[PDB]
Symmetry: C3
Subunit: 192 residues, 3 copies
């Protein structure tokens, strides 16, 4: 099936969404119009449609078992979406929870999703930690560069695993400070 479906992951702060946007932006110039979607958002939308919530807070409290179903359906919806346009699913490779690294796209989601590319945007633990500091929305944690680095290591493994299970290729892009443009150009080459 034409219309590529890719998922752009990265650690909070690498600005995967940012370079994704500028890539779409710049790509649109050549008639290519990707549909960005946030996986967590889709589950929320499937929740409302299945009559199960009314806001993003009834999702966390939503039954653990049925939460797998919502993931399956959310994977179906997006799959159906590439029928009408190339899609970028903005989600996590692994979500860093206090209980540990949680897979953003478990296998039962990948079967319904069938991605073509898994982007893993990265940069230095240093850069990421500073970005979060010059960020007013944050200013809370104590996440060290080794922790960010460790996270980026697990995401990588998760991505590759996703790749093997889905056949999708895993692309690693470095979004380094004062070099945004190069990251963006890198991404554009893989989405085009």
């Amino acid at each position: 099936m034409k219309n590529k479906l890719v998922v752009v992951t990265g650690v909070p702060g690498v600005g995967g969404t940012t370079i994704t946007q500028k890539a779409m932006e710049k790509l649109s110039e050549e008639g290519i119009n990707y549909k960005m979607v946030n996986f967590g958002t889709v589950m929320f939308e499937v929740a409302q449609e299945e009559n199960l919530v009314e806001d993003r807070d009834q999702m966390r409290k939503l039954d653990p078992d049925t939460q797998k179903r919502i993931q399956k359906l959310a994977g179906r919806k997006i799959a159906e979406m590439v029928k009408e346009s190339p899609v970028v699913v903005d989600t996590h490779s692994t979500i860093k929870t206090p209980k540990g690294y949680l897979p953003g796209l478990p296998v039962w989601v990948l079967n319904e999703l069938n991605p073509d590319i898994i982007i893993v945007v990265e940069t230095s633990g240093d850069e990421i930690l500073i970005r979060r500091l010059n960020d007013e929305t944050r200013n809370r944690d104590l996440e060290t560069t080794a922790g960010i680095e460790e996270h980026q290591i697990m995401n990588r493994a998760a991505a590759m695993t996703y790749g093997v299970l889905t056949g999708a290729t895993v692309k690693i892009i470095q979004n380094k400070n004062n070099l945004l443009d190069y990251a963006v150009e890198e991404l554009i080459s893989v989405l085009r």
Copy 2:
């Protein structure tokens, strides 16, 4: 008491078992009583009821397809166990054999356990090597720190795959010298 299955993994010497023992102790006096059990142990117990072996090293040389049945059965037996008590499985992410790294939880075993967390305990290659050099009943082979770190790199990857194959969270706890109590407390919290 009811359900919550977890697997604690670690390379020999990191003391994943130890910190698990402490955690389980401080937990029983909180009402939470986990039944710990070794995956190797159960497989043996299972092979015996099937009258397949006498001693453990008899399973060394055991039919490849038999080992798969045993595993699937030992993962199922351990599975039923979560019905009457939260369980912690003491096992290896991968076993460093001279034939390479053997996955401790093959997909068919994962589909039986359906664990919730995959604990991965680590420390520097140096710390482990010195813990191995000092061990009395050990003193064998000649593994290098890089080797130990290689094993930990692979266990991390293995762990992550398990998480992707079951939706289970992957938590890395650092059990470093003279910091045993921080690791125990950290393990307790995820078992909470």
Copy 3:
């Protein structure tokens, strides 16, 4: 019964090379492995389905059809282990502009059922220089960190194959001037 091992490594590691040196030895010891490149087998299937007639036409091959050939490939190689132990030469992940592509997707793994996955590697510096000196490869512009990243992703994928098929994952270093030690280690896991 016949062992089925798949050998991997980034281009330049001499992964195929140590495997050949290893087969010569195991041969004069009775054990005879049949080496085969997964890419060739794929092409072989395709050039029989009349879908392709040139190694290059494979690239142009349909994306869904590409999968059907990978399955058929695993099935042939699988059937090969009925006759002799088999070594499959392939990449854990092929480093493309689109990124790291898994050399053995799960639908291939199920047909293959390998017993051992081998990861042949060395330092970013050795690979890079080995490539540099080859009259053919002189302008790929991939740095040592680049190769190292590729090797990192190779381990992950190789490990995933093990988790999915139960196969063991043996990492082996093939460093300059120590070729024989790499070949030796390989012989130990193959016999």
